[PDB]
C-alpha cells in the first residue's frame, strides 16, 4: 500500500455525498480496517476534487512540516468519534455530518494526499 492508497482507504468515500445513517461510522471504521481509532474523518467528494487540494492553499502541518494544503472549498465530511460505550472488541462511533475545509499533506510525482491533518 502506497501512502496515497492508505489515505484513500482511511479517509475517502466518493460512493456517497454524505453519511447515510447514524451507523455510517460503525459500518466504515470496521470496513476500512480502523477497528479503537478514537477519531477519523471520511471525505464525501470525488478523488479528483481531493487531489486538487494539493495545488491550493499552502499551510503548516501539525507535525511542523510545511507541505500541507487547505481546500479552497468546503467539502462534505463525516466526523467519526468514539462514544462513551465503546471498549475494543466492540467499538461504537458517533457519526456526525459536516461541511468543512480540509487540510492534507501532499507528496509524489503525481502530487497527491498522503495524510489527513485537520478540517476547519
Amino acid at each position, epitope marked *: 500500500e502506497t501512502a496515497a492508497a492508505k489515505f484513500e482507504r482511511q479517509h475517502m468515500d466518493s460512493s456517497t455525498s454524505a453519511a447515510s445513517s447514524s451507523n455510517y461510522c460503525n459500518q466504515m471504521m470496521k470496513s476500512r480496517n480502523l477497528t479503537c481509532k478514537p477519531v477519523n474523518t471520511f471525505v464525501h467528494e470525488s478523488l479528483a476534487d481531493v487531489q486538487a487540494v494539493c495545488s491550493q492553499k499552502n499551510v503548516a502541518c501539525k507535525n511542523g512540516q510545511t*507541505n500541507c494544503y487547505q481546500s479552497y472549498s468546503t467539502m462534505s465530511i463525516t466526523d467519526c468519534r468514539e462514544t462513551g460505550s465503546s471498549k475494543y472488541p466492540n467499538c461504537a462511533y458517533k457519526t456526525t455530518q459536516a461541511n468543512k475545509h480540509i487540510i492534507v499533506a501532499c507528496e509524489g510525482n503525481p502530487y497527491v494526499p498522503v495524510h489527513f491533518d485537520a478540517s476547519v
Partner: nanobody, 121 residues
C-alpha cells in the same frame, strides 16, 4: 494555473558567478518553502538550497556551502540563487520548486522547467 517563471541559467568559466531567479506566478497566497534542486545527466536529482517565506529555515547541500547563497523576498513567491566560485562539478540542470518542506523534493509539487548551468574549464 500557477506558472513557475525561472530565468538566469547559462555558461560561465570555473570560478565565475551566475544568479538564478524564480517566481511562482498566478498563486494568490505565499508558499512557505521554496528551494533549488539540480540534476546532472544519468544522476540523481539532488537538493541545493531551500528557504522559508520569513527569511528563516535556510538549508544547503554541503558541496555548495560557502559558494551559493539562497535568498527570497520576505512574504512573496520568489527565490534566488547567487552562485559564486562555480566548479565544473556544478554543471547541471537546476530546477526551481515551491510549496514543500526543506530539500525533501517529494514534498514539492510546483516545479519550474529547469535552466542549464554549465561551468567550463
Amino acid at each position: 494555473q500557477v506558472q513557475m517563471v525561472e530565468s538566469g541559467g547559462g555558461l560561465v568559466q570555473a570560478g565565475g558567478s551566475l544568479r538564478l531567479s524564480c517566481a511562482a506566478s498566478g498563486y494568490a497566497y505565499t508558499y512557505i518553502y521554496m528551494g533549488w534542486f539540480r540534476q546532472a545527466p544519468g544522476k540523481e536529482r539532488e537538493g541545493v538550497a531551500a528557504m522559508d517565506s520569513g527569511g528563516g529555515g535556510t538549508l544547503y547541500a554541503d558541496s555548495v556551502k560557502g559558494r551559493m547563497t539562497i535568498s527570497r523576498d520576505k512574504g512573496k513567491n520568489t527565490v534566488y540563487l547567487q552562485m559564486d566560485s562555480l566548479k565544473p562539478e556544478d554543471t547541471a540542470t537546476y530546477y526551481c520548486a515551491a510549496g514543500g518542506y526543506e530539500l525533501r523534493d517529494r514534498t514539492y509539487g510546483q516545479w519550474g522547467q529547469g535552466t542549464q548551468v554549465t561551468v567550463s574549464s
